[model samples]
Target: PHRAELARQLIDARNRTLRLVDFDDAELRRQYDPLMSPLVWDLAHIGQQEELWLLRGGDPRRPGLLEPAVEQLYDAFVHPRASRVHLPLLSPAQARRFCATVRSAVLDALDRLPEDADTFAFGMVVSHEHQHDETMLQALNLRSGEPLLGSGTALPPGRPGVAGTSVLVPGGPFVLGVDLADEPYALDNERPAHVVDVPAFRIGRVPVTNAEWRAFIDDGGYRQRRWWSDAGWAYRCEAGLTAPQFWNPDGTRTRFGHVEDIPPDEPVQHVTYFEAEAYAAWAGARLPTEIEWEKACAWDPATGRRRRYPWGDAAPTAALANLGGDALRPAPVGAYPAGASACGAEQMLGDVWEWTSSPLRPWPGFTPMIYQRYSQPFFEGAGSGDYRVLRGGSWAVAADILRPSFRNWDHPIRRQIFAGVRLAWDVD
Candidate 1:
């Protein structure tokens, strides 16, 4: 039953990607930035990755040569994002056919495989496709003049609670990662559970909202060099950044291609790690370390156990989180009381991917898994040092991949993601 469900999910994800680009051939080939691949390329790459992992074998070094030319064309590691647009990518129709062929093969393979066969590879491909769906939305937002997508309904008008309130966590020793033996689908970066001692600290009950961030901007948070690190300041100056990306010169900001007045109570999105860090510094607090963020969300003092999610082991529902692209925009902070952690931290699992103080690093017994490029290449490679860890999942994240132990990272200066901030303070 579970295997059938997973296969269905993979199909749904592929359909969603196709829907985003089906209207226009020109839109499908348009590249948003040097950092992002063209929409058609991403579609074909999904097929290539699926073929490499499930049908051929889960070998990253040599992916059993299924359409060698196609594989080479979509090889993410070999062809940088900036160079992908120059490649002789398949036409939109050809890309769709390739995608359909790979999906059919994957479904057939799933039927033939033993019940206990590793379904982790299947889960990885599904997760990857869903992530690209969100990326496609970002690309659509960058296009001019009322791009076809909607950002979803805004939160109903009502104050959820006090903004910037902090939740106190009486921290101690807690497990930091997933136990590989217990979690068959755990990603490479989330494996080899280990213990860490954390000091008692206070964290924002919810992510910092547009209202709170606006205060920083009005107070000249960007202009004050003291609030930013030397490197952060340099980047800020070079980019001429004064506010979060997508924010207009007016009080409004673009949300999924539609410009609207910035919602005061909604969690701020599209802010870079540098901006998040600068906001924390200006607020006289700091972003929580990845462990601190995880403990606050997963540790239950009442039972002294770690939960799979901030809201416990139950799968996320509409009542609990703003996930799976349901609303397209973040729910107003404190909107989902049922999603609060044991420590009373709200919106800890969804809304936006919260920035953490930690850099992307491996656990003590780290080993590369099925996909070597997934997380390992970013460990010490070029531009790796610039990336910082982000905890929790965002509104666009699929529920299956949204867990307290799951890790996401990006370059500090990149603000194109649905990233947000939560401030933490020492319990002195």
Candidate 2:
């Protein structure tokens, strides 16, 4: 009954959300913003998806669920090339009733289905919800609005103060990616987790902070090409940029150009992988390789399993990581000591995502997820090899997205998010 009731309510809420979007002006929907798409399309697609999968287990409550007008209006517009011009409009009440009928029918079906069928249905909904969740986050970030998710819980009082210098993690035979036993549900790329022997290393105890980055700027880090790799130098020249993206020339303000007088002791944001590499090179250090980062977090001896997060199985709390919360700005480095890896690396779970000096490639024997487009499309040959790995998570990430084993990648030159860095040293 609870599942049925919640489903109906959520569907109703979703339709109401779409109705509001339809009422908005054309300019709002046509926003060419990189971080968001028109809301109308996403809303309709999600509704259709919910109906399709929930009814997969032989639910027959609504024969009209696949009406021609509904399919033509919502189904055909998923692809980008299908221009979103003059689409059929739906009323709030009509949409709500549609969702309610589907939700109730699905719930009724779930009641009589076998255990496997129930599990399948649950997993499908979870994935669908997560997709919408990411879209909602990206939209909010593009608008520079406060997080779309509710305000996260606050951090525990008086967590450890910031730690300085890199923590030496003696890397050896470490397992990379997800192990089968680690999670009841893991996507295909995370499967067949295998071991790789990595060289010894030390990673920064904390992510590079705003004040530290400011020092680099004050010392003319950008003016000096010695720090830049050949590729980085080319990028700098092409973009004609002297400072971090979203940073002001004065080095004391944000991109909005207002004098922010923010404390210099915060973690820096909006740095790209190339910038991270250059900054590390400038500081006589380098970014950790993916194996090194994974070794630090996943090789916990007590569990002998790949823990989804650095701080063990405790669900992410604000005290554990700065994810989904009002560390609205990146906190000072090492702010989450509780989130430290077994190797004493701080902020490995959150703060800002730390760039690693490894290309985004599938682990050995990787298979595609049921939804092949997510990780499969990003495999080696798809122009994805050029992207670097980023570890930990960001303040902008939702709680579900912030896991130690979760891998995220972005192009080396794109620097629009709250990204930062941590320096690592090679072991002799």
Best prediction by lDDT: 1
Clashes of each: 0, 0
Per-model TM-score, in order, reads 0.95, 0.76
Q: For candidate 2, what is the lDDT?
A: 0.63
Q: Write the per-residue lDDT of candidate 1 for residues 1-428, one digit (tens) a residue.
A: 38879878887887788777776888778777777888888888888788888877766456443457767888876888878888988988988887788788889888888867768888888878888888877676666677487668555432556478999989689888987576667789998889889999999999999999999999999999998889899999999999998899988997767889998898999998889989999999998998899999999988888888888888898888888765778888778888889999998887899999787888899887778879986774445466788989888888866678889998888778889999999997
lDDT for each residue of candidate 2 in 282-351, tens digit (9 for 90 to 100): 8889988877887787677555555667777798887777765344456666567788777777777766
| Candidate 1, superposed: residue stretches over 4 Å from native | 60-67, 153-158, 380-383
Estimate candidate 1's alpha-carbon lDDT, on a 0 to 1 scale: 0.83
Ten contiguous residues minimizing lDDT sum, candidate 1: 153-162
Model 1 residue 207 lDDT score: 92
**Distance from true location, Cα of 370 in model 2, Å:** 1.1
